[PDB]
Amino acid sequence: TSELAVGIFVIIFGIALFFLAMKVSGLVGTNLSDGYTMKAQFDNVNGLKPRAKVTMSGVTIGRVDSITLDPVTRLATVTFDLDGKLTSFNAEQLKEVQKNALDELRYSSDYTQATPAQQKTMEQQLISNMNSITSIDEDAYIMVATNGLLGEKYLKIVPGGGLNYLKRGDTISNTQGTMDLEDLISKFIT
């Protein structure tokens, strides 16, 4: 009877057509993540690959996106992609920052010598600023790194503390250096 032939037609037929498309695009080009981006300067990105890893404390955070040259400063500029669930990371974090602000701000002459109106202004800008950060503190470095004594490349993005954060989309300024064997040799360094 058609009762069965129709049920048989739908099963697999209606699975397989979508299956081929979804089981490929999900593997070769279609994705979704709460990404944020940031920019940085470097003096010498020797060998860093365009798809190298970006890490905090050794946990993978994100990926190198694009490596380019500025021909009139002769500096490298590298863009990052960071996954927000591992960095911003929830709502409680904002409250923790606000709490840290209550402990760190008004712990100095900034508020002692300020009128209540000025103290309120400082708290208001604090909220505005913190509302859009991804928790990398302003004392942080960036440098390049590698898998080990042979392998591919990466960026350690360590930290150093304080109630000062890079706003999402901003540039991490205080960065430094590389490692190159050509110079270690010429300087006769161990």
């Binding site: 058609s2 069965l4 032939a5 129709v6 049920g7 048989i8 037609f9 739908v10 697999i12 037929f13």
Partner: protein, 254 residues
């Protein structure tokens, strides 16, 4: 319109049920030992007549692996790697698949065509009235020739593939005989790099021949059906070999 697919699927699957029943009868009961003395004849058309193809393909595959291995391995360790890669590739993945598919082609379509004609001409049917059960007289020795023949061919394919690999990798391209041979001994274990090639070969031999017999012994006595049966035996045993190869290799080396 749509129900058409429905009916197609339903009937093809019913047919697998039938095939399973046929297989059971042919393997389950075979008391007529006096007539099985002829399967050695039957083997002529499955095994003997197929060495030329398996041998030539084995040589080309060995030479190709030699050249591709080498152009990659010069950057990693040809002195040690031609030996290990040529022998593991042939023992684990290619003799069991390339020989299995060439066999499915050359022996498979020929065998199904032959049973097909036995049925179409009504020749086979005339045996029922003589009291000679066609499964014990016609089918039995054909299925058995398939089981023995493919495994022996599988080994030869690899034996030739080793000759091919060495012939270019060591003798024309500059590599040491010493490390080629010792490398193979260091990494190839009888237990189970040689043994797993054989196990997969038995599985394929049974599955592939089983299908060829089944389709040749078709229901519908229409001349158009012989060509259809031949195309289908190649397609079905071909996918089945690849499907089962995946699962078996996944276990054997996982």
């Amino acid at each position: 319109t749509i129900a058409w697919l429905g009916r197609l699927v339903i009937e093809r699957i019913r047919g697998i049920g039938v095939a399973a029943l046929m297989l059971l009868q042919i393997i389950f009961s075979l008391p007529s030992a006096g007539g099985f003395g002829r399967f050695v004849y039957q083997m002529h058309r499955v095994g003997v007549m197929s060495l030329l193809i398996i041998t030539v393909s084995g040589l080309f595959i060995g030479l190709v692996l030699g050249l591709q291995g080498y152009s990659i391995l010069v950057n990693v360790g040809s002195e040690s790697m031609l030996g290990t890669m040529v022998s593991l590739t042939l023992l684990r993945e290619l003799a069991p698949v390339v020989a299995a598919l060439l066999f499915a082609g050359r022996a498979g379509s020929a065998l199904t065509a032959e049973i097909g004609s036995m049925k179409q001409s009504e020749q086979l049917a005339s045996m029922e009235m003589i009291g000679v059960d066609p499964l014990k007289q016609i089918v039995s020795p054909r299925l058995w020739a398939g089981i023995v023949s493919l495994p022996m061919l599988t080994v030869i394919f690899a034996a030739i593939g080793i000759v091919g690999g060495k012939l270019v990798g060591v003798d024309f391209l500059g590599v040491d005989e010493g490390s080629f041979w010792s490398g193979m001994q260091n990494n190839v274990q009888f237990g189970h790099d040689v043994v797993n090639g054989i196990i997969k070969s038995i599985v394929f031999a049974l599955l592939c021949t089983w299908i060829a017999v089944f389709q040749g012994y078709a229901c519908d006595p229409t001349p158009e059906g012989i060509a259809t049966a031949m195309t289908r035996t190649v397609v079905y045993s071909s996918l089945c070999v690849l499907g089962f190869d995946f699962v078996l290799t996944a276990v054997m080396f996982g």
